[PDB]
Design a protein around this ligand. Structure first.
Ligand SMILES: [Zn+2]
Lengths: 144, 342, 97, 287, 175, 839
RNA sequence: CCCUCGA
DNA sequence: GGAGAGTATAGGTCGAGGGTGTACCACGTCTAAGTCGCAACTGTTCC
DNA sequence: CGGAACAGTTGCGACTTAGACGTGGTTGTGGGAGCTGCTATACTCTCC
């Protein structure tokens, strides 16, 4: 890695992008167990999705060694690798309901408002469930 | 309106409805409409139209869709960047991000648990509203409504707070950093010094130059290996001092006093091993650093590569900048006692 | 070494010192170790690598649902990662196998 | 280098690669703690803000209707041609009518029915720099800005060479406002760089624009680098706007080079100096 | 039964704006009050068949709310405290590393450890190549005798002899 | 704090000032709480007669054992059954009550702490006239601030409308609320009709009638709920006019009384707002914006209509330590009340005794949360006795109920004419806290209502009497006060016919001596304790005088003290009151004296012994060391100083040495504030001081096992372990330099963390010992000294430790610091510098 | 982060 | 259309030493700690 | 410096357990703290 960097680009990250980055979904509020001081599985610190906390050691302890580098424990699902990956590996949360990214709603001027030609007070009433909005009407059927 | 006619239309609240309006949105139509309004229109409505066309036209280009403004999945930052450390007293400290993520996860899971139980619509809508509010707080907290507060009514620091502010990533961690091979101490007046020299305490110079000393006394019989050199320097064995004098020769250092108002707030000097724990500053540069000697302290940085040393000797050397870069007037100039004496 | 300290370095126009302060003296994780390795062996200082705080910046941006990529002149993005074998190869070479 | 001239520090001609904008900003900011009018005036000038104690300026030569009654001042100007009469709305009685030399006349205060030239100040006080731009042209605004800025430092016993303030002022007008888009795709009202504006004008000029004066904040946030602007101010705003626009930072800036750990494109980091090839001469290798 | 759903939506929902004001009193935070009221409604709707038709609903829901707050409260009180911090102090990081299995290593430590250990290398060189490979595998990589024999294409007995003999050899060589 | 406890000292002083039937801080909380009744009125619980038991442990015991200085609190709780008539009277233990020491401090978890008095705005009504509207026209605002309750704001609009804001709620015409209080649209025109702006507001009022008004009010408070008439009126009743959710203190009541002139007959009965207070507030505001200079209200008399000064000390109040603690007691006590109510419905009467109803946990927890989390409860600053003394005298504007640092403008930080004799204008930080922290003046008191008073001398018929009167800031504005520098002869007559005085709102004027009311009781009356110690203060500019006051509290205690030749006379009375000096409580003869203690035999035949603090570490690492100044057989008196403290010499504050000084440039080494010292001050230890560091280490449970404190440290030479004892802990009296081991400790290390070379040796050599890392506690860089102390706490014993911590070791190292280049010296005039050279 | 302090 | 108001932004640098847990019972559900056997697995000991 | 033969150790793998620990139900009342003592400027919204 030298200066080959040419450009640096932003775009909106699609849900597909977010799920491609992710190494797993975080399903649990728990952080670490107090007695073991080990990260709870499928939690914010989970080793299975984010990577091992100790070099070359999986969560269950079946594999502790470099000899196993690159393999995934059948029991715990952790990968034998360096703990360094815990700074480069991202998770994700699958939302039960869609959610607006607040940068594009509450920022001034409201980007959603300019896109849909909606008043930001009205947009607020919709997003926060103080008002209904009409997604579609059937013109032919209503006329008939 | 749904009880009758409900089969002739569709309606919803929340972000799923906004997602629908975006899915059904004709971009080119609204763009050409806006361009027509800009052309044939005038007044404030022309301004509204233009400002809207900036956004819509922005989304007109390919590879970029408005759908991204509504998320069905929220990314999670790696744990090392939001760590959790044990404290003296058996307690723990977490980044605020962990608590914000925790609220999002709890409200999402409760929304699933309510969907499965066939909960009344008003309750499910309450849970959806709370999920939207918690992802709001996670992204930009306090941007809408009152902020989510931890203990002490301290509002938690969102993902937007990492980037912005004087303590943000850009200002604190990117345009500036803490560095190796640096030290600091209180400054005293150096009246015996030549302009290109500065007094360096022995212990400061031994720490800053530690690897150079180590290699040097490894080459000489003093140390058997480099690790014996390390332990030998950490104990301050008498053999090191002579070696130090040799490794410091014509190796410049950078001195800095905060605040740095202009580039002469950092100057390069040749270090001189000096007795005591204080940095000795040449009397003539006190104008450039604004050093009051009432307890001012300064910082020392050690150039490493050939290019850095060369830059210190040539560009930043104390006696190569005598003149004020602003007015061109002389800066390192007699003042106070010196003036009186003359 | 803060913002205003960097302005001074830029005002002097000393690029290598400013780059050295912000990479191998602070952030660059392979460079900081290779630099110490070079001083002890009495060799030239190695060329700096990528500061960690930039990779951290990209990750905090992704967490905001911003899709950021560092593009080559080809127009294709660049994965930021290190080959894990180099350290193991040196460790195995140190034992003579 | 030649347009900049001497480097005040070295006393010689400025080297190629010296970063004179940072030197200018440091030179202007360092004395700032000594300014007791004052430093807020230096801010008011550098941000191109409509001044308090605003002094109106004449649009065109003509005759003056001076109402000036009941604790109020109102100035109408009937141009010498058949043009419409320009009317200044509100001028408080605390302001003073300017004493000046009337063309084809003597030196006296502004009075009703008087004849005034184009660029005449109607009152005494601070002039709106935007007005002197759209009337007297950019080379006049340069003079007004450098003089009014340097005046504050002079009053405090501080001498800054004019060239630093000139660097900043140069950055203050790089751009033109788009009036009529024409065939050039430029959105009207946007602020486009002068060079880019003249380049995008191709008959094989449809784009119409007028020079703009924009403060240092607005000119900073307007840079082509979203990375440079995100690290300055309004980071949320800059990042949303930059994401929506799929902007691609070119990385050529020096602040961007600082961020990514690349040698700044200034001083010893310039391609000219950094790629130097060093070889010993044959005669020296002989010995 | 849908009767329970309709009767629930008519009788229970108007009490929300009341119950929420109660949840505040316990949490004294709006977010935890919202979460508390919501979990309460989970319990209530899930268990609404057990409620008696004519009896007063307000006290019932109130008790569910309190009891939920207590389950959460004792639950949180058994766990060690998690303090949210805007930034983790450098003192906290070092203090935590004093008890760590691996501390905070300077670039110097990393660079020195990465240097070859000469004595060990030259001692290993004196071993016969077979003993060197075997003792390497076992005492460094940690292979079992079965896998070491599989890699070296010898019976396990050979692995045992070479491990013992190379080990004693290194013991005499290095001391 | 004596008022909080209801101490007999406070009782006598209360009887001296006159008795209102005085109630202590605790007594008042108990009486407002009682009775605790069932919602059916079937039963009641009442508290009375609180008592404090003996202290659990002495002060230095808590400091050593990490305890809290405290005493058990007992109250008599009487339960009554309103049916059977049966009474049950019990004694309840309310908790271990944190106690104020003799020095006016608290020890919480072993650490000594100070509760800084808080500057807040007293409850009352405050009018603000802002001309800053863009129209250039003046607007008039008012705030009604209670002690506890809801905020109420009235604002005349820039658009000319009278608005109302309730707890930040959005504005409505002032008539809307008045109508909703039961007022007709006509009755408002009767009282308020004189206002052309109130006439314009009633038409802009959108709806009329009490039902629509009360309904529109309930909508503003609750965003999404249904309104109801009886719910909303009982809501508005309980929001303001009810004692539970809205409390104006007696301070607020009297301030509103005096500000609106409503009750002249001085009824003390109830403190809450009244409908006549709302009418009086709008009427006051109405005439205000009109420009009237006076107003008279029905049943009210001659009150000037004027704006209020927010920073004036008659409008600005001091919440002292007793009042802060009382407020916390009220919170936790109300929580206990909630528990008692919930317990009244569940329990079986005749199966209930009070102690079954009373749960004390939230009270103790409420007290603990205050001392732990509060900005006012502060780590005591003890560099020397002066830093600690003024710390207890600090008046802080920052905190809960105060103002945020973000919201504090430059107008709050300015010296104010009401500060004279009350808050020192000199002493205050020069950093970002400038003007936000101040010192109580030497002669100032805090009156029972929280307002600061200063004494003055009655001036009668141009004569200066010896009668003393303590005046508040309000009382001081009605009179004419002559400065102390005003000359007087042997007779009370003034020397000059014109004298410079402060008369009205802090204007300074040459004035007739004929009319003079009061005079300052002395100079230094306007100055703090630290400022009163600056000799020739009047010759120093206020900035350097500020630097001098702050710098005295940064002085380190020297190995030997020396009083100044040139004092102000404040040094003795400062050292005694600070309390770091030992004083005889009773006159007697010294029976025995040693460095450890002094015993005094009173003429009673009773004796009293004083133990000496010997080489004790202060919070900042300075050396608190007491030495006896008396000899065996000496006769001492009550109040006499028995023993010197760290910065005292013979009982006078000695913060430094008397040095022979020459004023002259010397060869550039004293260039620009740099100081040149004689090496005599190094050789004779005149600037030497002792500094004591506390190094703490604990063995805890980790991922891979438990940590062990041991003398067995892998790959560590026996030479370097030589000063460790058998536990692995350094031996008392050893000389330790940076890098030396204070306490050996090992931590379990995983297999993967071994180097390949380290793995090979452990295998072939048959080492089966646990793999560990050396976590031993070592001396930090640039530190040296002697080990003067060790404390060990083990889980093996009953020593109470945090969860997961097996053993906790503290090591105390003491260093003698000779003066050296780079140290900072200062005089009392603000003159400072580093030592640039010692010659 | 906050408290408090140095230039 | 066009004006006020309501909301958004900004507000010096570097250092030193300190810093926290009211609230249902009466139980079944699970887990957090184990002692304890065969393989599986390390090691000597030869010929 | 091999290939079996033979005899000591971890170490995985079950299962009993006793207690922390979370679950049933849950029916007289009962709606938070805290604050708001910052200035100045640009610009979209939104009431008109
Ligand atoms: Zn595993």
């Amino acid at each position: 890695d030298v200066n080959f960097f040419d450009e640096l680009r932003i775009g909106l990250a699609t849900a597909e992008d977010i799920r491609q980055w992710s190494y797993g979904e975080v399903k649990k509020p728990e952080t670490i167990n107090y007695r073991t001081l080990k990260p709870e599985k499928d939690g914010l610190f989970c080793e299975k999705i984010f990577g091992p906390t100790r070099d070359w050691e999986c969560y269950c302890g079946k594999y502790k060694r470099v000899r196993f580098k690159g393999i995934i424990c059948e029991r715990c699902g952790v990968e034998v690798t360096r703990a360094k990956v815990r700074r480069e590996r991202m998770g994700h949360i699958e939302l039960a309901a869609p959610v607006t990214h607040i940068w594009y709603f509450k920022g001034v001027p409201s980007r959603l408002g300019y896109l849909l030609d909606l008043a930001p007070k009205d947009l607020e009433k919709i997003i926060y469930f103080a008002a209904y909005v009409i997604t579609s009407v059937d013109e032919e059927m209503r006329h008939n | 309106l749904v009880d009758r006619y409900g089969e002739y239309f569709t309606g919803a609240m929340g972000a799923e409805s906004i997602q629908k309006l975006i899915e059904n949105f004709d971009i080119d139509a609204e763009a050409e409409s806006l361009r027509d309004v800009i052309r044939n229109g005038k007044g404030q409505k022309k301004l509204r139209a233009l400002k809207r066309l900036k956004v819509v036209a922005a989304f007109q280009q390919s590879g970029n869709s408005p759908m991204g403004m509504v998320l069905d999945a929220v990314p999670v930052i790696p744990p090392e960047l939001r760590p959790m450390v044990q404290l003296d007293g058996g307690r723990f400290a977490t980044s605020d991000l962990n608590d914000l993520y925790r609220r999002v996860i709890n409200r999402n899971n409760r929304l699933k648990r309510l969907i499965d139980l066939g909960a009344p619509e008003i309750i499910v809508n309450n849970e959806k509203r709370m999920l939207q509010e918690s992802v709001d707080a996670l992204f930009d907290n306090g941007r809408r409504g009152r902020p989510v507060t931890g203990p002490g009514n301290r509002p938690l620091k969102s993902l937007s707070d990492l980037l912005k502010g004087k303590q943000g990533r850009f200002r604190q961690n990117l345009l500036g950093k803490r560095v190796d091979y640096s030290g600091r101490s209180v400054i005293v007046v150096g009246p015996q010094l030549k302009l290109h020299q500065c007094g360096l305490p022995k212990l400061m110079a031994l720490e800053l130059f530690k690897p150079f000393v180590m290699k040097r006394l490894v080459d000489l019989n003093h140390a058997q290996n480099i690790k014996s050199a390390k332990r030998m320097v950490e104990r301050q064995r008498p053999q090191v001092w002579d070696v130090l004098e040799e490794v410091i020769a014509e190796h410049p250092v950078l001195l800095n006093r905060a605040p740095t108002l202009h580039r002469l707030g950092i100057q390069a000097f040749e270090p001189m091993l000096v007795e005591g724990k204080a940095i000795q500053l040449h009397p003539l540069v006190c104008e450039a650093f604004n050093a009051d000697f009432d307890g001012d302290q300064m910082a020392v940085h050690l150039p490493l590569s050939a290019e850095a040393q060369a830059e210190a000797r040539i560009l930043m050397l104390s006696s190569n900048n005598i003149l004020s870069p602003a007015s061109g007037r002389p800066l390192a100039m007699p003042r106070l006692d010196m003036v009186t004496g003359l | 070494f803060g913002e205003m300290e960097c302005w001074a370095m830029q005002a002097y126009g000393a690029a290598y010192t400013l780059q050295e302060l912000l990479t191998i003296k602070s952030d660059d994780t392979v460079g900081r170790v290779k630099v110490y390795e070079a001083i002890v062996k009495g060799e030239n200082i190695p060329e700096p690598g990528i500061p960690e705080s930039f990779k951290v910046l990209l990750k905090e941006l992704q967490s905001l649902c911003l899709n950021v990529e560092v593009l080559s002149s080809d127009g294709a993005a660049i994965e930021l990662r290190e080959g894990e074998d180099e350290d193991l190869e040196r460790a195995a070479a140190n034992l003579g196998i | 280098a030649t347009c900049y001239g001497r480097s005040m520090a070295t006393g010689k001609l400025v080297d190629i690669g010296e970063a004179v904008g940072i030197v200018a900003a440091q030179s202007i900011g360092e004395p700032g703690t000594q300014l007791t009018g004052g430093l807020p005036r230096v801010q008011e000038l550098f941000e191109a803000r409509v001044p308090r104690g605003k002094a109106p300026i004449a649009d065109v030569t003509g005759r003056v209707r001076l109402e000036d009654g009941e604790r109020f001042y109102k100035i109408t100007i009937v141009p010498d041609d058949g043009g419409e009469e320009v009317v200044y709305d509100k001028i408080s009685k605390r302001q003073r009518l300017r004493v000046f030399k009337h063309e084809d006349g003597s030196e006296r205060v502004l009075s009703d029915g008087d004849h005034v030239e184009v660029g005449q100040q109607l009152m005494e006080g601070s002039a709106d720099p935007h007005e002197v731009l759209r009337v007297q042209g950019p080379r006049e605004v340069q003079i007004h800005l450098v003089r009014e800025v340097q005046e504050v430092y002079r009053a405090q016993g501080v001498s800054i060479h004019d060239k630093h303030i000139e660097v900043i002022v140069r950055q203050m007008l790089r751009r033109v406002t788009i009036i009529d888009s024409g065939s050039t795709e430029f959105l009207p009202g946007s602020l486009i760089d002068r060079a880019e504006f003249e380049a995008e004008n191709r008959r094989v000029e449809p784009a119409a624009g007028r020079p703009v004066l924009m403060g240092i904040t607005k000119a900073s946030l307007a840079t082509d680098s979203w990375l440079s602007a995100a690290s300055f101010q309004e980071t949320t705003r800059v990042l949303t706007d930059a994401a929506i626009n799929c902007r691609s930072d070119k990385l050529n800036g020096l602040k961007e080079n600082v961020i990514i750990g690349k040698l700044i494109p200034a001083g010893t980091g310039i391609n000219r100096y950094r790629n130097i090839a060093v070889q010993p001469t044959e005669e020296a290798r002989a010995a | 039964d849908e009767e329970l759903t309709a009767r629930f939506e008519r009788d229970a929902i108007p009490l929300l704006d009341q119950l929420y004001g109660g949840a505040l009193r316990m949490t004294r935070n709006p977010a935890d009050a919202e979460d508390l009221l919501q979990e309460t409604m989970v319990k209530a709707y899930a268990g609404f068949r057990s409620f008696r038709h004519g009896t007063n609903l307000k006290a019932w829901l109130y008790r569910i709310l309190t009891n939920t707050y207590i389950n959460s409260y004792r639950k949180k009180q058994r766990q060690p405290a998690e303090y949210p911090t805007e930034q983790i102090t450098d003192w906290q990081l070092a203090s935590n590393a004093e008890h760590s299995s691996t501390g905070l290593r300077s670039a110097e430590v990393e660079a020195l450890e990465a240097l070859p250990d000469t004595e060990i290398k030259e001692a290993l060189q004196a071993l016969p190549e077979e003993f060197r490979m075997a003792v390497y595998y076992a005492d460094v990589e940690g292979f079992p005798y079965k896998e070491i024999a599989e890699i070296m294409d010898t019976p396990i007995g050979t692995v045992m002899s070479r491990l013992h003999r190379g080990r004693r050899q290194l013991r005499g060589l290095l001391a | 704090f004596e008022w909080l406890i209801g101490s007999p000292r406070w009782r006598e002083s209360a009887a001296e000032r006159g008795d209102v039937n005085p109630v202590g801080g605790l007594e008042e909380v108990l009486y407002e709480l009682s009775p605790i009744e069932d919602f059916s009125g079937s039963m009641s619980l009442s508290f009375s007669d609180p008592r404090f038991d003996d202290v659990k442990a002495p002060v230095d015991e808590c400091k050593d054992k990490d305890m809290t200085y405290a005493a058990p609190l007992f109250v008599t709780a009487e339960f009554i059954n309103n049916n059977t008539g049966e009474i049950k009277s019990q004694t309840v233990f309310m908790g271990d009550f944190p106690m104020m020491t003799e020095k006016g401090t608290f020890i919480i978890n072993g650490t000594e702490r100070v509760v800084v008095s808080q500057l807040v705005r007293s409850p009352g009504v405050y009018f603000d006239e802002t001309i800053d509207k863009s129209t250039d026209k003046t607007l008039h605002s008012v705030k009604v601030i209670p002690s506890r309750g809801a905020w109420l704001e009235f604002d005349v609009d820039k658009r000319d409308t009278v608005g109302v804001r309730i707890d930040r709620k959005r504005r409505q015409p002032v008539t809307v609320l008045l109508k909703a209080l039961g007022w007709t649209s006509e009755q408002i025109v009767e009282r308020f009709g004189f206002s052309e702006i109130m006439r314009s507001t009633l038409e802009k009022d959108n709806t009329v009638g009490t039902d629509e008004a009360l309904l529109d009010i309930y909508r503003k408070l609750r965003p999404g709920e249904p309104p109801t008439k009886e719910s909303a009126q009982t809501l508005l009743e309980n929001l303001f006019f009810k004692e539970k959710r809205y409390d104006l203190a007696r301070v607020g009541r009297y301030k509103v009384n005096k500000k609106l002139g409503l009750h002249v007959g001085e009824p003390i009965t109830s403190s809450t707002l009244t409908e006549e207070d709302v009418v009086a507030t709008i009427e006051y505001l109405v005439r205000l914006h009109e420009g009237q200079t006076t107003m008279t209200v029905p049943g009210g008399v001659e009150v000037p209509v004027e704006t209020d000064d927010i920073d004036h000390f008659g409008n600005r109040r001091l919440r002292t330590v007793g009042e802060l603690i009382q407020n916390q007691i009220r919170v936790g006590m109300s929580r206990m009340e909630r528990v008692v109510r919930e317990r009244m419905t569940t329990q079986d009467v005749e199966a209930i005794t009070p102690q079954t109803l009373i749960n004390i946990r939230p009270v103790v927890a409420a007290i603990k949360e205050f001392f732990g989390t509060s900005q006012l409860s502060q780590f005591m600053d003890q560099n020397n006795p002066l830093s600690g003394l003024t710390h207890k005298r600090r008046l802080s504007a920052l905190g809960p109920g105060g103002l945020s640092r973000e919201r504090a403008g430059l107008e709050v930080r300015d010296v104010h004419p009401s500060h004279y004799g009350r808050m020192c204008p000199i002493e205050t930080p020069e950093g970002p806290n400038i003007g936000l922290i101040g010192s109580l003046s030497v002669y100032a008191r805090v009156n029972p209502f929280g307002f600061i008073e200063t004494p003055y001398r009655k001036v009668v018929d141009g004569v200066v009497s010896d009668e003393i009167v303590y005046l508040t800031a309000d009382e001081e504005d009605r009179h004419v006060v002559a400065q102390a520098n005003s000359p007087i002869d042997a007779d009370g007559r003034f020397v000059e016919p014109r004298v410079l005085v402060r008369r009205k709102a802090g204007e300074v004027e040459y004035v007739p001596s004929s009319e003079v009311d009061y005079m300052d009781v002395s100079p230094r009356q306007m100055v703090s304790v630290a400022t009163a110690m600056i000799p020739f203060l009047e010759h120093d500019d206020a900035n350097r005088a500020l630097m001098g006051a702050n710098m005295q509290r940064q002085a380190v205690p020297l190995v030997r003290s020396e009083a100044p030749l040139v004092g102000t006379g404040m040094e003795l009375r400062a050292a005694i009151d600070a309390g770091d000096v030992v004083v005889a409580e009773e006159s007697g003869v010294i029976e025995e004296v040693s460095a450890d203690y002094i015993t005094v035999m009173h003429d009673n035949g009773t004796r009293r012994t004083y133990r000496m603090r010997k080489f004790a570490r202060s919070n900042h690492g300075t050396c608190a060391n007491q030495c006896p100044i008396v000899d065996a057989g000496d006769r001492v008196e009550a109040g006499q100083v028995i023993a010197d403290g760290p910065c005292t010499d013979d009982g006078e504050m000695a913060l430094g040495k008397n040095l022979l000084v020459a004023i002259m440039p010397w060869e550039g080494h004293n260039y620009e504030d740099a100081i040149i010292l004689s090496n005599r001050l190094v050789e004779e230890d005149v600037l030497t001081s002792i500094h004591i560091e506390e190094h703490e280490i604990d063995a805890r449970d980790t991922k891979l096992g438990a940590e062990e404190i041991t003398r067995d440290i892998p790959n560590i030479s026996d030479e370097v372990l030589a000063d460790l004892d058998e536990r692995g802990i350094v031996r008392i009296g050893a000389e330790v330099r940076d890098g030396d081991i204070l306490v050996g400790k090992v931590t379990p290390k995983g297999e993967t963390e071994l180097t390949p070379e380290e793995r090979l040796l452990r295998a072939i050599f048959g080492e089966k010992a646990r793999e560990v890392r050396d976590t031993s506690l070592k001396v930090p860089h640039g530190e040296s000294g002697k080990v003067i102390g060790i404390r060990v706490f083990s889980r093996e014993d009953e020593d109470e430790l945090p969860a997961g911590v097996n053993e906790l070791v503290r090591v105390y190292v003491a260093q003698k610091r000779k003066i050296s280049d780079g140290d900072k010296l200062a005089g009392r005039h603000g003159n400072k510098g580093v030592i640039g050279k010692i010659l």
